[PDB]
């Protein structure tokens, strides 16, 4: 029918987009400049060993308050670790096992859980009751939740399965704005310091930067050939590092509307399972399926240093909101604080 004309128009517009990006493409001054703030070899210490997990840790998220870190173990348990004291505020048992993601709310009083179930759990950690009770169960998810981020304390972005990363109203339990267009489950979910754009990484290998107000997807960054594990916005929200199931991380630029630059080594072949920026954003913290993780000089395209530890893969990374330290949610059932 007429679908052939539409598809050919899509092809020619993709060609136009490639042409426009290549026109935007210039020599990366960061790669060209080898003297602009070299970072040197950095060696870092485990100052807090948050022992107290006996199962693997899938996702760990600090809060904007940056004192307590929510860490989820796929056995079905949340620990609101107090990093400063080596204790916990809550060990919340989770009804569903295999909990993929836990995100600490900006207010630091809500926590969110997405597991293999099709329900997003919202626990109000702080109440006059003195203990955690479920603020809101969110039902009606089509696919399985993979990553989630609190856009507010009454609504949240929930990258479920079935190409769904729809915004969800916590109070009503109904998705308000629906985000569709990927292939397979929307698995990654990056929240910008802009807080106006979330770039979702899915099995489409396409970092779709969506606006958090309109279902129309702001940009469609591409260059990754594998499903996208983690995306981290720059501390500006004008760019994001994207790590997929490859040995190549890709720093994509919103202003350039194209991949700003790429991170790759022959020393590493494991998928970049977690990506993150420093307070400056000059350091790229890359956790790998390798037992150890690494830091690149984010704006020199080279490895700043190697963070070696654990004996098992590190499934998630979280940098202290200030750039003080990093917590390594790993599969060796420990969360190490590196500072």
């Amino acid at each position: 029918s007429e679908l052939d004309q539409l598809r050919q128009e899509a092809e020619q517009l993709k060609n136009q987009i490639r042409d426009a990006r290549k026109a935007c493409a210039d020599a990366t001054l960061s790669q060209i400049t080898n003297n602009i703030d070299p970072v040197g070899r950095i060696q870092m210490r485990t100052r807090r060993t948050l022992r107290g997990h006996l199962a693997k840790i899938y996702a760990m998220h600090w809060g904007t308050d940056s004192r307590l870190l929510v860490s989820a173990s796929q056995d079905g348990k949340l620990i609101i670790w107090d990093s400063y004291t080596t204790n916990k505020v809550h060990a919340i048992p989770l009804r569903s096992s295999w909990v993929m993601t836990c995100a600490y709310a900006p207010s630091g009083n809500y926590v969110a859980c997405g597991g293999l179930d099709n329900i997003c759990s919202i626990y109000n950690l702080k109440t006059r009751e003195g203990n955690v009770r479920v603020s809101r169960e969110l039902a009606g998810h089509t696919g399985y939740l993979s990553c989630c981020r609190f856009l507010d304390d009454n609504q949240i972005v929930t990258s479920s399965g079935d190409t769904t990363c729809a915004l969800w109203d916590i109070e009503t339990g109904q998705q308000t704005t629906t985000f569709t267009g990927h292939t397979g489950d929307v698995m990654s979910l990056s929240l910008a310091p802009d807080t106006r754009l979330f770039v979702s990484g899915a099995c489409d290998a396409s970092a779709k930067l969506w606006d958090v107000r309109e279902g129309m997807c702001r940009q469609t960054f591409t260059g990754h050939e594998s499903d996208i594990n983690a995306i981290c916005f720059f501390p500006n929200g004008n760019a994001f590092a994207t790590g997929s199931d490859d040995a190549t991380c890709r720093l994509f630029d919103l202003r350039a509307d194209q991949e700003l630059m790429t991170y790759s080594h022959d020393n590493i072949i494991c998928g970049i399972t977690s990506v993150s920026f420093s307070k400056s954003g000059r350091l790229l913290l890359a956790g790998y399926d390798d037992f150890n993780c690494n830091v690149w000089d984010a704006l020199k395209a080279d490895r700043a240093g190697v963070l070696a530890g654990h004996d098992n893969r590190v499934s998630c990374l979280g940098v202290t909101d200030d750039g003080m330290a990093v917590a390594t949610g790993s599969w060796d059932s420990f969360l190490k604080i590196w500072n």
Binding site: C24, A25, D257, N339
Partner: protein, 63 residues
Amino acid sequence: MASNNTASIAQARKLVEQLKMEANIDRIKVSKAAADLMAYCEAHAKEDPLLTPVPASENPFRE
């Protein structure tokens, strides 16, 4: 249905759609945006404890 086709085309539309405002967005050149980011990071390099020496009283992980 000779002009609707039971809405099997919508997906392609979305593709076309986004590409249009993938084109509508301006292009900021690679080197200039790179330099902007270097300036931001280096200005924020001093306030990044990872990029600076840390006294035990500075980090809440030794006090």
